Ligand binder design. Structure first.
Ligand SMILES: [Zn+2]
Ligand SMILES: [Zn+2]
Length: 487
């Protein structure tokens, strides 16, 4: 189905034999060492805990997005009565519950799993400080800055290879290495988490799945780095050579942490800046781990980028942007066709107005430097009642975000995310008006899909108020504010 709010306001955009074989002994041994070292590193200072029912309730009520009934499933003491029961089973080492019932069972499982392994996300075990290479909890407003730090590290090009169907390439060996978490746990906690882990052995909820994919991808890049640096090679794949074991152990212990900070890793998405370009041909362990690269012959050298500003990560590239007061932002950027395309899809008049509004406010926060999106966002916001709370999923590409899910003034939240809470903004002086929030540079805007300079869009910009009026009329008699004369 089509969002008719974005539709009526974006007129120019109209006419647009199974696999993962288990690894060989050599590779399994190196991964084992690497995953042993990484777990010990991620457990450095934090210590595991169970997550509470209250925490789960708080987590259900915010973002991201089903949940219509989740909120409703929680306060029902019959739901915590099945949960109580199934938890009592998990503690024996038995599981079975993983309409009313066959929805409660599904949601219960998510709680049990959040109770037992939730600490990985909630305490940011994969956050950059704790994981060195991870980026958990960072919005798009932060990631570019991380790419600029990674690119700051001297060496080869920056690589960013995708895997050919990641979840498909997880081996039993990856699973056992992930399951070492258990060794960090004791008591009930350990029994409960053991029950959750032993479920995929018979399919996690993205809560845990992201943490575990990131953990595993971090390790995979560590191994590919070792091989690029000549610590291991082709002759170590089947069986590790004469005393390479300790060479590998001491390589982890003395380089692991530095090398982690040459990475930005989100689930199956990774960016790595190795010591040199030998990395481009380090494919022996990679391929034998079944982590085959997408869209490239098994043994062709990888290619990388020189400029951090064009490396893709979480479907965006990132750019430096100079504001009128001389300050520099680093901002996300992706094809504008994909951005408007996504907002024109509706996955009810109020509900779709509220979703258009979240797309608009999402754009105002993340993609304000795009001329068309800034204009379209204000049209949307002008056409949807001021008091309608933005609703619905706008972030496909599940990272974090959601600061746009509000009724608060968008200049105020822009200031909070881009200045006040931006740790890469030294000078904390606020921006007083939208006109001081910068655009990207005509030529760059045009490069990423802008229609500026086009006729269809000229007559759209000039007539925009007619379209806004048309949407106001369909939605009906409500309070509207004009945001067009802040452009
Ligand atoms: Zn169960
Ligand atoms: Zn761009």
């Amino acid at each position: 189905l089509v969002n008719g709010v974005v539709r009526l306001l974006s007129k120019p955009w109209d006419t647009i034999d199974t696999k993962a074989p288990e690894p060989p002994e050599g590779v399994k041994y190196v991964l084992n060492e690497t995953t042993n070292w990484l777990w010990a590193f991620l457990a450095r200072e934090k210590r595991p805990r169970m997550c509470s029912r209250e925490e789960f309730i708080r987590k259900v009520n915010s973002n991201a997005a089903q949940w219509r009934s989740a909120r409703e499933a929680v306060e029902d003491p019959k739901f915590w009565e099945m949960v109580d029961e199934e938890r009592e089973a998990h503690l024996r080492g038995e599981c079975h519950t993983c309409s009313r019932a066959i929805w409660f069972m599904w949601l219960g499982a998510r709680f049990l799993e959040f109770e037992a392994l939730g600490f990985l996300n909630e305490d940011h075990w994969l956050g950059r400080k704790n994981s060195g290479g991870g980026v958990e909890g960072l919005g798009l407003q932060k990631l570019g800055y991380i790419l600029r730090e990674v690119g700051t590290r001297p060496g080869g090009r920056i690589y960013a290879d995708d895997t050919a169907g990641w979840d498909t390439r997880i081996t039993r060996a990856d699973l056992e290495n992930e399951a070492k978490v258990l060794e960090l746990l004791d008591g009930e906690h350990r029994r409960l988490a053991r029950a959750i882990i032993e479920l995929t052995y018979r399919g996690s909820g993205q809560v845990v799945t992201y943490a575990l994919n990131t953990f595993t991808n971090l390790a995979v890049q560590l191994v590919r780095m070792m091989e690029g640096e000549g610590v291991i090679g082709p002759d170590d794949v089947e069986k590790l050579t004469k005393g390479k074991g300790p060479k590998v152990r001491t390589w982890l212990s003395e380089n692991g942490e530095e090398r982690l900070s040459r990475m930005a890793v989100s689930g199956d998405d990774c960016v790595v800046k190795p010591l040199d370009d030998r990395f481009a041909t380090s494919l022996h362990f990679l391929n034998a781990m079944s982590k085959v690269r997408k869209d490239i012959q098994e043994w062709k050298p990888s290619t990388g980028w020189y400029d951090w500003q064009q490396v893709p990560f979480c479907s965006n590239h990132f750019t430096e942007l100079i504001m009128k007061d001389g300050r520099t932002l680093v901002t996300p950027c992706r094809g504008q066709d994909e951005l408007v395309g996504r907002a024109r899809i509706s996955p009810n008049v109020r509900d779709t107005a509220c979703l258009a509004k979240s797309y608009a406010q999402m754009w105002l926060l993340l993609y304000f430097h795009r001329r068309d999106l800034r204009l379209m966002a204000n049209a949307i916001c002008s056409a949807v009642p001021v008091n309608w709370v933005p609703t619905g999923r706008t972030t496909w590409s599940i990272h974090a975000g959601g600061e746009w899910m509000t009724t608060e003034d968008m200049l105020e939240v822009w200031n909070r995310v881009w200045i006040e809470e931006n740790e890469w903004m030294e000078d904390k002086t606020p921006v007083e008006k939208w006109s001081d929030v910068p655009y990207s540079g005509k030529r760059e805007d045009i490069w990423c899909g802008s229609l500026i300079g086009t006729r269809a869009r000229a007559t759209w910009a000039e007539n925009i108020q007619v379209a806004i009026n048309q949407v106001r009329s369909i939605i009906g008699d409500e309070k509207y504010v004009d945001y067009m004369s802040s452009l």
